[PDB]
Each structure stands twice: as C-alpha cells, then as structure tokens.
C-alpha cells in the first residue's frame, strides 16, 4: 500500500524499524509512531477529533479507538506508542461499536443548528457521523447549553456547539505562544474561555478558526457569507 495523503516517513535510524500488522498487512515504522501513525503509514485512515498532528497528543474524545489482540480494552490509537509485532484490528465489531458508542455521546448534547452553522458543509462531526456512526439516534431528554462570550473582532464563537476536544487550548498554549484560552469547570458543563473580558490578541490568532473541527469557532468577517461547496 501507499501512505494516505502521500505522507513521507523519515527514518532517522534505518536499523530501528519495528514491523507491525495494522490489519494483516505488515508495515515498518520507526520507534515511536503511535498506533494511529502506523495505520496512517499503511494507508488506513482513522477517525480523530482531539488529535492534531501539529499539537501535543491528548487522549480525550475516545474516537480513534482500535482493537489490539493482546489488549483487553480498546486502546487509544492516537496515544499508544507502537510496539514490535502488534496485531492491530480496525474493521472489527469491537472497534466499530466503540466508534458508534462514542459518537452517540458526542451527538447527544450537540445543538440542532446545522442549517445556521457556518461550518455546515465541512464539519468533521457530521462527515464522520455519516460514515462512522449509527443513523437511529436514541437521546430524547433535554440537552445542555452554554452562553456565547465575545472574544476578538475576528473570531465568532458559539460555544453551544463545542465538543470539548481542547484542541484550541493546546494550540493557544503551544503554537500561538500566548496563554489566554483555557478550559474551565468540571464534569458535564465545563466551559472553554478566557474567564475575563480579554480578547485573543496574537498575530497568528486566527488559526483557531480552522483547527477547531466543529463550528464552535468560526471567522467573524466570513459570518454566513457563503458555503464551502460554492
């Protein structure tokens, strides 16, 4: 197979290349290269919500779960480092029912504002829900809600439609270099914000628009101007 997206694997040590079985097709990857990256090398594309290849690895949102033969529980492929001679399993009932079960929880409290979401046509949540999800839908009770707090003249925020993937927090803490965005609260009902009136004052502060998967953070100048398909 060929790597998905044309990704280039840089072998800084030719001697160290552990061989793993992603789905029965053995591939060679260097030390490190967590199970997600090993599957990326072998041309297998795994769902992801919290994992960005440019930021630190976080384990929440439990969406990239796969099955390893020598593992009782499904493992987080985006965080578990590769080991020699693993028999990974992706298209398995365990690794599938894991994904529908997780995405049902993701969608149970999501608001129904798709027609007015500025990220309607390019949302990872709905695009993955169509592929890796159950169509029925079981939740019937009252959802939660979060009020919207202004920050920046160019970042329109609707935190009601925010899965707490903490990707924006990690970006602001690591790449942007200014620590103004953080995660506040505990349990079901934790919010993400500055906790004060301050706005994101950074030169590369507009990258939170793209990095956030769902339409929680969208550009304010491009508010409702057009859809992605047109």
């Amino acid at each position: 197979r060929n790597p998905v997206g044309g990704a280039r694997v840089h072998f800084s040590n030719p001697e160290d290349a552990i061989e793993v079985f992603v789905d029965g097709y053995a591939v060679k990857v260097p030390k490190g290269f967590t199970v997600l990256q090993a599957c990326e090398v072998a041309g297998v594309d795994i769902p992801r919500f919290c994992y960005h290849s440019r930021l630190s690895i976080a384990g929440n949102c439990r969406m990239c779960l796969v099955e390893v033969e020598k593992s009782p529980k499904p493992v987080a492929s985006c965080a578990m480092p590769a080991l020699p001679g693993m028999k990974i399993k992706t298209d398995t009932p365990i690794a599938k029912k894991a994904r529908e079960g997780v995405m049902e929880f993701l969608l149970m409290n999501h608001p129904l504002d798709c027609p007015i979401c500025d990220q309607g046509g390019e949302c990872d949540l709905q695009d993955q829900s169509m592929a890796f999800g159950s169509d029925r839908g079981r939740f019937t009770e009252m959802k939660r809600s979060v009020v919207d707090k202004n920050l920046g003249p160019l970042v329109k925020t609707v935190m009601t439609r925010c899965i707490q993937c903490t990707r924006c927090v990690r970006f602001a803490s690591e790449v942007a270099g200014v620590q103004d965005l953080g995660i506040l609260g505990r349990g079901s009902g934790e919010e993400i914000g500055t906790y004060v009136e301050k706005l994101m004052t950074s030169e590369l502060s507009g990258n939170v628009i793209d990095i956030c998967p769902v339409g929680a953070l969208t550009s304010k100048p491009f508010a409702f101007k057009a859809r992605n398909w047109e």
């Binding site: 608001p111 009252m142 939660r144 809600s145 009601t160």
Partner: protein, 62 residues
C-alpha cells in the same frame, strides 16, 4: 403594514418570561411546522436571542 422590515419588526416583540436555566424554542406551537429545537442558556442579564426565530428569552427570576 409593510414599512417595517423584519429587522425592526422582530425587536418590538417583548422578551419571553420563563423560569429555569434553559428554555427550548421550537418556533411554531406545532413542533413539526417550526424550526429545529434550540435550547438556549439564558444566564446573562441580556435576553438570549434564538438564532432561528429571533425571539428573545429572559429570566424572570433573580
């Protein structure tokens, strides 16, 4: 009358009085003939505007 555009006509409707932290807005009294349901957390002292209808909801208590 038709000189009042919806922009300045929806603002003349007084905000709704409701108890609780959140309220569910469906548009029409018949759920099938309204918009998708929109739970809004009305915690700020300003009225919380439904994104579909434009109706404003404010908390009677406190």
């Amino acid at each position: 009358r038709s000189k009042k555009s919806p922009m300045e006509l929806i603002s003349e409707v007084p905000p709704i009085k409701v108890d609780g932290r959140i309220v569910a807005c469906e548009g029409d009294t018949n759920p099938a003939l309204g918009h998708p349901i929109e739970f809004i957390c009305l915690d700020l002292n300003e009225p919380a505007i439904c994104k579909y209808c434009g109706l404003r909801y404010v908390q009677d208590h406190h």
